């Protein structure tokens, strides 16, 4: 009775807090700029070394001549990506741009060159500092020394990736080129992940990242996300370590084993196995992967899993999950209230998103997958 | 079961929020200054008109020569108040001082003079802008036009008075001179009430404010607070309008009726009648008056009173009061959480104090008094 009223108050409040966080993290001017007579000269590069080298372009921090104190990055493409991405509403984890133009760029700036040639130059306000590939490459020693801290950051990056991929579903868009060098890391007022490079995007060697259904005769992005889990854990592409899985219809025991090094290793292993299911109809959805990642970060632990399996009735399982939700929502609400007397981190926003929209039915589905 | 856990979390959190608010409202240097060779010349008065005229002194804003940019007020006394007040720990609603000395003050500054004479000069960091007597005198038209807004401010000032009087009880100190010109109104980083003038304080015409037990042959401050309720509502002292109550042992029907003009009028009438009980053993305590004022401001309304009287059992009454507490604590917690994304007012702190320490037993006692 009254318990339902307080449950509704916390749920509606956390949704409002999540929306308020979203508007605070997404604030800023987004009107596209106008370019004309030598707009390449209006961008004074603040450095000669690149600030980021992605799979589709090179990035340079620049001072726009008509606004010299705000952050701008010059994206010099290597060779459709703008057409597909411009049709999407803005999203925290999907790359935005404020204009583009052609320009003659010196070859000394391009690593894949060196005669002056014309290239597509894109301007963005979210300056990338590195890619996830660069982060993974530089974090081998930290993964060995601090497996709990590193593998938690992996879950947080994967959670942002699922959010951006979930944004593509209502458009019926598949990225089709999810590689670690296409995921950028930027700051927020470098832990903000940004999906980029839509050159292979579909609007409704290289085959090592193609789902099995593509090779035989809309779960492509889910399958490529399963490969990324291995790579972010400093493991090779499973279809490069065992290059005979694509020529068969493998099972769970055929996939290479993820080392058991942190409280997140078993869940990430189960998540990858579900994403790498050779049958598309049984391959989990990217929203289910999001729920798994939320569960590994904040959701109910394996200690509650034992009570879940031991409960004979669905009513007792619903009470167990509902009690966990009510307590976690209360704790998070207290956390926000205490900050009003002392900022809001990215993890606080994502945690509010989880508890605000989670239900006992959604938790029951995620738990049964992780069992 | 789980309901008790969430109830304990909210209660412990609101107590922590109230303590954090208290430390934020009480922050500032409080070390006493040192005075010597002509310290009266080190206080440059920023104006020649007084900033406040209390019952015991006149106040002038001043710039201290050794700290010329901070707020200081010069308190020039008219004639023990320091001895009793200095022995008390600091309190939000009790006057603090940072030093005192003798000085020859020009008669033009003193309204009760005009030959130069020596006076006791007290320095305080909380600058008074007016007294409650001045506020009541200037708010006659607003009481007639906006009775709901004015009589709510009266409850808020009376609540702060009860807090300061409650601070005196563990010291066994009675003020014995609670008059509207002795209550100062200051700002907070003018709604902050400050009790001053401890010249008549006891440490364990004029008789119109003396309790009946004093006239016949430790409830003195409670009795004088009941007189203040009438005066703050622009009514005369009940023992001046009906100057024959002290020569008898009056009842509730003998006291002058407070006009019924706002949702707070009936509660303030009942509160005054309890504070003006001629029998000290039946006169309510100043902590009970605080609970009544908290109930009139935020506590359960008369709509819940009908359900209270209709409940036959104590269990159902306890459930009614507990459900009200759980909902109100949830609402207030949400309010603090929403401010973490957008300051904290004095009323927010006082409301947190109420809900954090209120119990079903304390509410049941306050309700039965107001019935």
Swiss-Prot record, chains A, B:
Region (Required for homodimerization): 1-27, 300-370
Post-translational modification: Phosphorylated on tyrosine in a CSK-dependent manner in response to adhesion to fibronectin and to EGF stimulation.
Domain of life, source organism: Eukaryota
Domain named Protein kinase: residues: 29-305
Entry's localization field: Cytoplasm, Cytoskeleton; Cell junction, Focal adhesion
Biological role stated in the UniProt entry: Probable catalytically inactive kinase. Scaffolding protein that regulates the cytoskeleton to control cell spreading and migration by modulating focal adhesion dynamics. Acts as a scaffold for mediating EGFR signaling.
Quaternary state and interactors: Homodimer. Interacts with BCAR1 and CRK. Interacts with PRAG1. Found in a complex with PPP1CA, PPP1CC, SHC1 and PEAK1. Interacts with RASAL2 and GRB2.
UniProt protein name: Inactive tyrosine-protein kinase PEAK1
Species in which this protein is naturally found: Homo sapiens
Residues of the full protein shown: 1285 to 1743 of 1746
